[PDB]
Scaffold this motif. Structure first.
Motif, mmCIF file in Angstrom:
data_model
loop_
_atom_site.group_PDB
_atom_site.id
_atom_site.type_symbol
_atom_site.label_atom_id
_atom_site.label_comp_id
_atom_site.label_asym_id
_atom_site.label_seq_id
_atom_site.Cartn_x
_atom_site.Cartn_y
_atom_site.Cartn_z
ATOM 1 N N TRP B 25 36.504 46.846 79.027
ATOM 2 C CA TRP B 25 36.787 46.111 80.283
ATOM 3 C C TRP B 25 38.276 45.748 80.349
ATOM 4 O O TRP B 25 38.977 45.986 79.345
ATOM 5 C CB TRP B 25 35.882 44.883 80.348
ATOM 6 C CG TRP B 25 36.217 43.799 79.372
ATOM 7 C CD1 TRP B 25 36.859 42.634 79.670
ATOM 8 C CD2 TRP B 25 35.894 43.731 77.967
ATOM 9 N NE1 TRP B 25 36.962 41.849 78.555
ATOM 10 C CE2 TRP B 25 36.382 42.494 77.495
ATOM 11 C CE3 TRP B 25 35.246 44.583 77.060
ATOM 12 C CZ2 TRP B 25 36.255 42.094 76.160
ATOM 13 C CZ3 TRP B 25 35.130 44.195 75.741
ATOM 14 C CH2 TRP B 25 35.616 42.961 75.304
ATOM 15 N N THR B 30 35.502 46.732 72.451
ATOM 16 C CA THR B 30 34.712 46.237 71.308
ATOM 17 C C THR B 30 33.677 47.303 70.992
ATOM 18 O O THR B 30 33.199 48.019 71.911
ATOM 19 C CB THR B 30 34.108 44.857 71.556
ATOM 20 O OG1 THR B 30 33.124 45.045 72.573
ATOM 21 C CG2 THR B 30 35.134 43.802 71.933
ATOM 22 N N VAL B 31 33.364 47.444 69.725
ATOM 23 C CA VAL B 31 32.346 48.432 69.302
ATOM 24 C C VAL B 31 31.828 48.046 67.926
ATOM 25 O O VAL B 31 32.545 47.394 67.147
ATOM 26 C CB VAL B 31 32.914 49.865 69.304
ATOM 27 C CG1 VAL B 31 34.031 50.053 68.274
ATOM 28 C CG2 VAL B 31 31.842 50.910 69.091
ATOM 29 N N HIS B 32 30.571 48.408 67.687
ATOM 30 C CA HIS B 32 29.888 48.272 66.383
ATOM 31 C C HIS B 32 29.793 49.667 65.771
ATOM 32 O O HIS B 32 29.259 50.582 66.429
ATOM 33 C CB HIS B 32 28.497 47.668 66.532
ATOM 34 C CG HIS B 32 28.497 46.209 66.799
ATOM 35 N ND1 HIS B 32 27.424 45.406 66.489
ATOM 36 C CD2 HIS B 32 29.397 45.413 67.400
ATOM 37 C CE1 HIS B 32 27.687 44.180 66.859
ATOM 38 N NE2 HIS B 32 28.874 44.152 67.401
ATOM 39 N N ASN B 35 29.447 52.718 59.305
ATOM 40 C CA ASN B 35 30.215 53.606 58.413
ATOM 41 C C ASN B 35 29.285 54.292 57.381
ATOM 42 O O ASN B 35 28.262 53.775 57.034
ATOM 43 C CB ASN B 35 31.319 52.833 57.691
ATOM 44 C CG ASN B 35 30.750 51.663 56.912
ATOM 45 O OD1 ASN B 35 30.849 51.610 55.690
ATOM 46 N ND2 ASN B 35 30.145 50.725 57.612
ATOM 47 N N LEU B 46 39.193 51.851 59.575
ATOM 48 C CA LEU B 46 39.701 50.924 60.612
ATOM 49 C C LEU B 46 41.085 51.364 61.083
ATOM 50 O O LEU B 46 41.295 51.524 62.291
ATOM 51 C CB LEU B 46 39.665 49.485 60.100
ATOM 52 C CG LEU B 46 40.219 48.451 61.068
ATOM 53 C CD1 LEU B 46 39.533 48.510 62.431
ATOM 54 C CD2 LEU B 46 40.082 47.070 60.478
ATOM 55 N N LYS B 50 41.999 52.634 64.989
ATOM 56 C CA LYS B 50 43.018 51.898 65.790
ATOM 57 C C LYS B 50 44.106 52.890 66.229
ATOM 58 O O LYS B 50 44.474 52.882 67.421
ATOM 59 C CB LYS B 50 43.620 50.754 64.974
ATOM 60 C CG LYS B 50 42.629 49.664 64.603
ATOM 61 C CD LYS B 50 43.231 48.656 63.686
ATOM 62 C CE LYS B 50 42.766 47.237 63.942
ATOM 63 N NZ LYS B 50 43.807 46.240 63.578
ATOM 64 N N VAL B 62 41.667 45.744 70.497
ATOM 65 C CA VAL B 62 40.443 46.335 69.925
ATOM 66 C C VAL B 62 39.798 45.325 68.988
ATOM 67 O O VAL B 62 40.522 44.628 68.269
ATOM 68 C CB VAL B 62 40.812 47.626 69.179
ATOM 69 C CG1 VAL B 62 39.687 48.108 68.294
ATOM 70 C CG2 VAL B 62 41.260 48.715 70.152
ATOM 71 N N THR B 63 38.469 45.330 68.955
ATOM 72 C CA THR B 63 37.724 44.615 67.907
ATOM 73 C C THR B 63 36.601 45.545 67.475
ATOM 74 O O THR B 63 35.776 45.921 68.306
ATOM 75 C CB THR B 63 37.202 43.261 68.393
ATOM 76 O OG1 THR B 63 38.197 42.449 69.030
ATOM 77 C CG2 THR B 63 36.583 42.497 67.238
ATOM 78 N N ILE B 64 36.648 45.955 66.217
ATOM 79 C CA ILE B 64 35.692 46.912 65.622
ATOM 80 C C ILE B 64 34.946 46.233 64.470
ATOM 81 O O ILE B 64 35.581 45.853 63.442
ATOM 82 C CB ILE B 64 36.441 48.162 65.147
ATOM 83 C CG1 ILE B 64 37.125 48.918 66.285
ATOM 84 C CG2 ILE B 64 35.513 49.051 64.366
ATOM 85 C CD1 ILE B 64 38.218 49.864 65.817
ATOM 86 N N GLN B 65 33.624 46.139 64.596
ATOM 87 C CA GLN B 65 32.750 45.574 63.566
ATOM 88 C C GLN B 65 32.063 46.727 62.838
ATOM 89 O O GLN B 65 31.454 47.587 63.518
ATOM 90 C CB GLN B 65 31.727 44.652 64.203
ATOM 91 C CG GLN B 65 30.714 44.089 63.225
ATOM 92 C CD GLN B 65 29.881 43.037 63.901
ATOM 93 O OE1 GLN B 65 30.413 42.052 64.412
ATOM 94 N NE2 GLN B 65 28.572 43.238 63.885
ATOM 95 N N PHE B 66 32.128 46.731 61.512
ATOM 96 C CA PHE B 66 31.452 47.752 60.674
ATOM 97 C C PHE B 66 30.181 47.146 60.110
ATOM 98 O O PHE B 66 30.217 45.968 59.668
ATOM 99 C CB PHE B 66 32.328 48.217 59.528
ATOM 100 C CG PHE B 66 33.543 48.962 60.001
ATOM 101 C CD1 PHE B 66 33.435 50.246 60.543
ATOM 102 C CD2 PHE B 66 34.784 48.382 59.908
ATOM 103 C CE1 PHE B 66 34.556 50.931 60.984
ATOM 104 C CE2 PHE B 66 35.912 49.077 60.320
ATOM 105 C CZ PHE B 66 35.795 50.336 60.886
ATOM 106 N N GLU B 67 29.080 47.866 60.134
ATOM 107 C CA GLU B 67 27.808 47.237 59.715
ATOM 108 C C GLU B 67 26.850 48.321 59.255
ATOM 109 O O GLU B 67 27.257 49.489 59.283
ATOM 110 C CB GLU B 67 27.196 46.372 60.809
ATOM 111 C CG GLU B 67 26.906 47.134 62.083
ATOM 112 C CD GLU B 67 26.396 46.299 63.240
ATOM 113 O OE1 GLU B 67 25.836 46.889 64.173
ATOM 114 O OE2 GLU B 67 26.493 45.059 63.175
ATOM 115 N N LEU B 68 25.726 47.818 58.730
ATOM 116 C CA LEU B 68 24.424 48.440 58.352
ATOM 117 C C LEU B 68 24.502 48.840 56.880
ATOM 118 O O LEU B 68 24.051 48.100 56.002
ATOM 119 C CB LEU B 68 24.050 49.594 59.286
ATOM 120 C CG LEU B 68 23.893 49.221 60.756
ATOM 121 C CD1 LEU B 68 22.949 50.189 61.455
ATOM 122 C CD2 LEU B 68 23.410 47.789 60.941
#
Ligand code: NI
Ligand code: NI
Lengths: 73, 68
Positions: B25, B30-32, B35, B46, B50, B62-68
């Motif tokens: 927007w 932003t994104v999840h 990895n 990261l 970027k 940018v805001t990038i969250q790494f998970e799982l």
């Protein structure tokens, strides 16, 4: 949402050194959305050791469940 | 912004297995990202995401969250 308590609780989380670019705004739904950049301590993998604690605290203490947390050193 | 091209380039990045909750927007992104679990994404993924978002899309907030 009390922004001071949110800041205090982020910095109170084990493995959090500092943060910046905290944004907390209302979605169309009226629910809280949060983004933040966290500098983690060198001793912790924040994906395993910080992210789950920040998610749990933001949900429990502030009712914030739309979160994007980026970690930097 | 072409979300299809953003999607391709994110998935083309070494260490990326998947992503969800992509939001763009007025530009802020932003994104999840899931990895590869054998990779710590903080150094190996990261900075790569970027620089790609900057070069390919002129996106730098940018805001990038790494998970799982
Ligand atoms: Ni940052
Ligand atoms: Ni997610």
């Amino acid at each position: 949402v009390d922004l001071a308590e949110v800041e205090k609780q982020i910095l109170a989380t084990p493995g959090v050194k500092s943060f910046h670019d905290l944004h907390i705004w209302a979605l169309t739904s009226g629910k809280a959305s949060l983004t933040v950049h966290v500098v983690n301590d060198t001793a912790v993998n924040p994906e395993m050791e910080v992210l789950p604690e920040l998610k749990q605290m933001l949900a429990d203490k502030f009712d914030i469940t739309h979160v994007t947390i980026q970690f930097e050193l």
